Design a protein around this ligand. Structure first.
Ligand SMILES: [Mg+2]
Ligand SMILES: [Mg+2]
Ligand SMILES: [Mg+2]
Ligand SMILES: [Mg+2]
Ligand SMILES: [Mg+2]
Ligand SMILES: [Mg+2]
Ligand SMILES: [Mg+2]
Ligand SMILES: [Mg+2]
Ligand SMILES: [Mg+2]
Ligand SMILES: [Mg+2]
Ligand SMILES: [Mg+2]
Ligand SMILES: [Mg+2]
Ligand SMILES: [Mg+2]
Ligand SMILES: [Mg+2]
Ligand SMILES: [Mg+2]
Ligand SMILES: [Mg+2]
Ligand SMILES: [Mg+2]
Ligand SMILES: [Mg+2]
Ligand SMILES: [Mg+2]
Ligand SMILES: [Mg+2]
Ligand SMILES: [Mg+2]
Ligand SMILES: [Mg+2]
Ligand SMILES: [Mg+2]
Ligand SMILES: [Mg+2]
Ligand SMILES: [Mg+2]
Ligand SMILES: [Mg+2]
Ligand SMILES: [Mg+2]
Ligand SMILES: [Mg+2]
Ligand SMILES: [Mg+2]
Ligand SMILES: [Mg+2]
Ligand SMILES: [Mg+2]
Ligand SMILES: [Mg+2]
Ligand SMILES: [Mg+2]
Ligand SMILES: [Mg+2]
Ligand SMILES: [Mg+2]
Ligand SMILES: [Mg+2]
Ligand SMILES: [Mg+2]
Ligand SMILES: [Mg+2]
Ligand SMILES: [Mg+2]
Ligand SMILES: [Mg+2]
Ligand SMILES: [Mg+2]
Lengths: 185, 148, 156, 127
RNA sequence: AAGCGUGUUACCUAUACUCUACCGUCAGGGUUGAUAUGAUGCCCUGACGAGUAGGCAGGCGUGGAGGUCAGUGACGAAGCCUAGACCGUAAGGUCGGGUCGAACGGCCUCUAGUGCAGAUCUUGGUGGUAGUAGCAAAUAUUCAAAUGAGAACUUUGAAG
RNA sequence: ACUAAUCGAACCAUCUAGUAGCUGGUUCCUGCCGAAGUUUCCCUCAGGAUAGCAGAAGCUCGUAUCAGUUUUAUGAGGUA
RNA sequence: GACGUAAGUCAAGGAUGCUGGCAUAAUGGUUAUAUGCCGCCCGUCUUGAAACACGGACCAAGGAGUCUAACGUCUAUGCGAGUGUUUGGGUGUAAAACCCAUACGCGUAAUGAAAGUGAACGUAGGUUGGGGCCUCGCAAGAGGUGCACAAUCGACCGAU
RNA sequence: AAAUAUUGGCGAGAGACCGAUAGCGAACAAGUACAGUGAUGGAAAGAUGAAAAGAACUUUGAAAAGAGAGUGAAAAAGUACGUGAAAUUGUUGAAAGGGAAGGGCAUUUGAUCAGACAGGCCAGCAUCAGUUUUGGUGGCA
């Protein structure tokens, strides 16, 4: 008998493979598993873990977010690496010539990057031109901007969105929401 | 696919995942939204504040078409120009020949002022505009025409 | 097909053995097993027979000839663990024993070389046996445990 | 024969019979887990039947091996049989039960040529 | 004392402790210029393993559906019986023999009216009890002949 | 009391698979983790909601934040 | 690692060498029986069941978390500031498959009871952390840039 | 008038539907047999064989029927008819049995059964390695 300090046979709680059955993603994982094992660069380990992520854990990264990242000092010639989708953004009006490595490009995003003079690149092409992740820049999209995150942690005096279908007057704007009607939250 | 459900996994187990003490019954707490003020009051006050009670004016015979006024922001204003024809206006950003952007045709009622349009004069036709939207448009060198 | 297929088959190549660190060293017999002692055979066809210990052989077996004229046991081998080494001794510095070895007793009606090799050794052996009285009678008689005999408290 | 293998250890050679299958005819001998609240078999009282546990699992070296030392491969025709041509040391052919007698002699003739051991060479054999 | 109080040893034995093997789980790792073609693979190292209610995972089985094995079969399909054999920890799978007579399987997927020991469960069938309890109200039957395979019980005669 | 073996409201069919916080049952295997009977509210006390206990999915990082523990220093308490 | 001047040897990252008998019911499996010890009848409600608590005489077959409208979390997929062909039309080898316009739904804007108004002072802000990347170092480390996210102080929009 | 409805009627075409305790109550002389005064309630019940070729004839018996013979691919298909499970029963054979029987671990005994001579089965000894148990004896503090 052992007085177990911790719970026995506890899984790590981290994805060790993509949940998907995408064959091209699996052999993308196969490449970077080899790279993260046989190379000491922390870039390969980060990218391999990001390949495992679920759809809400890889939010889309807009070209405007990429352009703002390139505005940083000394980052103008770095290779922007996005483990996910790069979407277009018409809000921005000037885009620089750069190399963006991503899983997916939308039609508008890929057109805009090419029109600026840049180049859209797959993660295997990143591996051939940067095996240890030389001068890269790993970007991530806004994870907590989802609709579901609004309702997370709902409670009194929390300021979170209630789960509700129809919105307006007669829809949860009454007793419990204003001091005139009973109390306020 | 009923073969992937837990009902197939509960075969051989007496209570089918419902407990021996709880003893899954018809309606132990009521039907529907019963007891929201009496015995579901804590749940209702925690997750649905404002459910009970009345709020302001009634509107007899409301027609949602009266309140039709879709909003277009300034950062999306230039999207109303076709993409091939857009860049040829950014270059030669000149007066006496400026793009007309009829937002009513595109399906918008009011223009707001998110801002940072390029400094290009554009003629903007809309039912309604905001104060800041017109300030930014006229600063860029364009003008707003009101239509109906 | 009745069964579909095993997708990948085991390699039929048999793997070689690893190098073994076990070296054959000579056996150290018991202190009581000095050549010329009189042994009591515990098992086999010659159960309870008194014999003479002549020579330790190469396959860890003792060579015995409890004289064939005395108790009818020829030259043969016994296991050292299946004998009782008694304290009574006879002198074996009158007998040639190098002729006997593993291939002497290799398998492949009594032969003639066995009979004559028995004759040469046992004339020497009984000549030494006749010195101290009653060994000839002692070797002739078989060994047996009596009621109330305790081999834990018995010495041989 | 087969590849030399470690000695076959079964860890339980007795069938795991269902509790009280010997007591009622309606209770089939196929193993069922006792899920009763007061079940002595479920509570593992001394003097009762043993339950299937993962500890009884077979050594992966000797798993799925017959005392001959081969794995049984079920074979339906001659074409199935050649799939064990280069695996005669590891797999042994077993003619399926619905194969006719006149096809069985063809399979056995081919198996003798290829050296493939047959688990049931005397099935449907006229004599 | 084989009782009581106290002390000293030796001994007995738990699914407990130590060591080792095997199963599984978890964890950390190794492995691509034939990894001597399987990278959810192969391998190394360490620890761990109780369980109702309950949760999750990996698998076994059933009816039907798409594809494939140019699968099996009247030289015998399916079904059924078998203190006959083998494989799996197990759900089960496979084979041999007997009966039988016309269809039915493996694998990858799809689907569900998909797995029973219970519900004083439904329908049907069958036991022990058991050749047992019983076939006892209404006063009552008997003889002979005939008939017929067969008469306490039918017909006739006689008697009551 | 009787009203077709039915009467403190006949029988037949339908609404109707009426409702039940109550009783009974709820059908394959193995592996891993693993409870609560307590808080607050309720025409509530054989029941629910709620917080707690549990599983699962994980996510961000990589030996920190920590700890049903002691020491040192400094408080607090009104029981034996 | 040890011994040996070396050569090499060894008990040093897990058993080898020699010998015998049998080659079949001999070992072993299955089954029946005997013997030693152990073993209360399952399901169920319950704090507690072998209960003098309840259901169960036996067997076969049937037999109980399904489908739908709307929806929460999570996951997979397609496209992505858009997205959804299948109400319809075209077409067809005809309930399949293929193709399509205008709309419409949800999303890209919120807020107020409402009339209404409606989101950049700034490198879309400052500070503290922050993976990754860059530079200098064999490296430890130092500096620069720091997406996601966490805390906080600000700025902007609606109501008061 | 058309675009719309249609568990009725008639005529069609279909099914990832059910397969005789299922599917309509009814696959069949089924809204039948049967029950109730009545309104109403309402079953059970498919399959020999390709073809009756449905067993001529002999014998025992009062007969049913048996035993033969014969038809048939099959009578282990005889209309009490495809296959023909279990409960329960008869016969035969084996085994055990002082107020239950059944079970688990281990072995005896009986019965039965599988593979392997190009190493399979069971052992003995020696030298080692790992874990132990039991002694003898030596030198020191
Ligand atoms: Mg359970
Ligand atoms: Mg229950
Ligand atoms: Mg077994
Ligand atoms: Mg079993
Ligand atoms: Mg209990
Ligand atoms: Mg005492
Ligand atoms: Mg467990
Ligand atoms: Mg058959
Ligand atoms: Mg037929
Ligand atoms: Mg069912
Ligand atoms: Mg049943
Ligand atoms: Mg049950
Ligand atoms: Mg019953
Ligand atoms: Mg009687
Ligand atoms: Mg009378
Ligand atoms: Mg009435
Ligand atoms: Mg119901
Ligand atoms: Mg546990
Ligand atoms: Mg109240
Ligand atoms: Mg109760
Ligand atoms: Mg938890
Ligand atoms: Mg006091
Ligand atoms: Mg006090
Ligand atoms: Mg036996
Ligand atoms: Mg007992
Ligand atoms: Mg009680
Ligand atoms: Mg009980
Ligand atoms: Mg009672
Ligand atoms: Mg009760
Ligand atoms: Mg009863
Ligand atoms: Mg059933
Ligand atoms: Mg029917
Ligand atoms: Mg009547
Ligand atoms: Mg029939
Ligand atoms: Mg037949
Ligand atoms: Mg027949
Ligand atoms: Mg029949
Ligand atoms: Mg039977
Ligand atoms: Mg008696
Ligand atoms: Mg017994
Ligand atoms: Mg040793």
């Amino acid at each position: 008998g052992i007085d177990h300090t911790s719970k026995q046979h506890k899984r790590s709680g981290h994805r060790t493979a993509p949940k998907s059955d995408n064959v091209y993603l699996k052999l993308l994982v196969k490449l970077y598993t080899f790279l993260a094992r046989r190379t000491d660069a922390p870039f390969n380990k980060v990218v391999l873990k990001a390949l495992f992520l679920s759809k809400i854990n890889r939010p889309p990264v807009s070209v405007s977010r990429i352009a703002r990242a390139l505005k940083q000092e000394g980052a103008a010639n770095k290779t922007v690496v996005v483990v996910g989708t790069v979407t277009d953004d018409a809000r921005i009006f000037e885009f620089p010539k750069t190399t963006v490595a991503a899983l997916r490009f939308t039609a508008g995003a890929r057109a805009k990057i090419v029109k600026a003079g840049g180049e859209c690149i797959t993660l295997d092409q990143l591996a051939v031109r940067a095996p240890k992740g030389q001068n890269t820049l790993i970007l991530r999209g806004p994870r907590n901007s989802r609709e579901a995150v609004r309702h997370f942690g709902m409670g009194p005096h929390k300021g979170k969105a209630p789960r509700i279908l129809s919105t307006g007057r007669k829809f949860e704007r009454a007793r419990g929401r204003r001091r005139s009607k009973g109390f306020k939250v | 696919p009923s073969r992937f459900t837990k009902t197939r996994k509960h075969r051989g187990h007496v209570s089918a995942g419902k407990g021996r003490i709880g003893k899954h019954r018809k309606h132990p707490g009521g039907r529907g939204m019963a007891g929201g003020q009496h015995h579901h009051r804590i749940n209702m006050d925690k997750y649905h504040p404002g459910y009970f009670g009345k709020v302001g004016m009634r509107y007899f015979h409301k027609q949602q078409a009266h309140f039709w006024k879709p909003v277009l922001n300034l950062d999306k204003l230039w999207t109303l120009i076709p993409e091939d024809k857009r860049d040829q206006y950014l270059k030669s950003a000149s007066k006496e020949t400026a793009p007309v952007i009829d937002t009513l045709a595109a399906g918008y009622g009011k223009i707001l002022g998110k801002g940072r349009i390029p400094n290009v004069p554009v003629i903007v036709k809309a039912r309604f505009v905001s104060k800041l939207a017109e300030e930014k448009i006229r600063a860029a060198g364009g003008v707003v025409e009101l239509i109906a | 097909s009745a069964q579909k297929a095993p997708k990948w088959y085991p390699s039929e190549d048999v793997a070689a053995l690893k190098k073994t660190r076990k070296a054959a060293r000579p056996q150290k017999l018991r202190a009581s097993l000095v050549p010329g002692t009189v042994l009591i055979l515990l098992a086999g066809r010659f159960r309870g027979k008194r014999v003479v210990y002549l020579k330790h052989l190469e396959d860890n077996t003792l060579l015995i000839s409890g004289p064939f004229k005395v108790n009818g046991v020829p030259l043969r081998r016994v296991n050292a663990r299946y004998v009782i080494a008694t304290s009574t001794k006879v002198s074996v510095e009158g007998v040639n024993v190098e002729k006997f070895n593993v291939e002497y007793f290799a398998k492949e009606e009594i032969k003639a070389e066995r009979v004559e090799d028995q004759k040469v050794v046992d004339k020497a052996l009984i000549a030494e046996i006749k010195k101290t009285p009653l060994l000839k009678q002692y070797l002739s008689a078989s060994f047996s445990l009596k009621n109330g005999d305790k081999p834990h408290m018995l010495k041989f | 024969a087969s590849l030399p293998h470690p000695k076959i250890v079964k860890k339980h050679t007795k069938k795991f019979k269902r509790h009280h299958s010997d007591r009622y005819h309606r209770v089939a001998e196929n193993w069922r887990k006792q899920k009763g609240i007061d079940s002595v078999v479920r509570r593992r009282f001394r003097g009762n039947i043993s339950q299937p546990k993962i500890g009884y699992g077979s050594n992966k070296k000797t798993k799925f091996l017959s005392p001959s030392g081969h794995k049984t491969f079920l074979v339906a025709n001659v074409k199935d049989l050649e799939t064990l041509t280069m695996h005669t040391k590891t797999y042994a052919a077993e003619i399926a039960h619905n194969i006719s007698a006149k096809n069985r002699v063809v399979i056995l003739a081919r198996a003798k040529a290829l050296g493939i051991k047959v688990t049931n060479p005397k099935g449907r054999l006229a004599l």
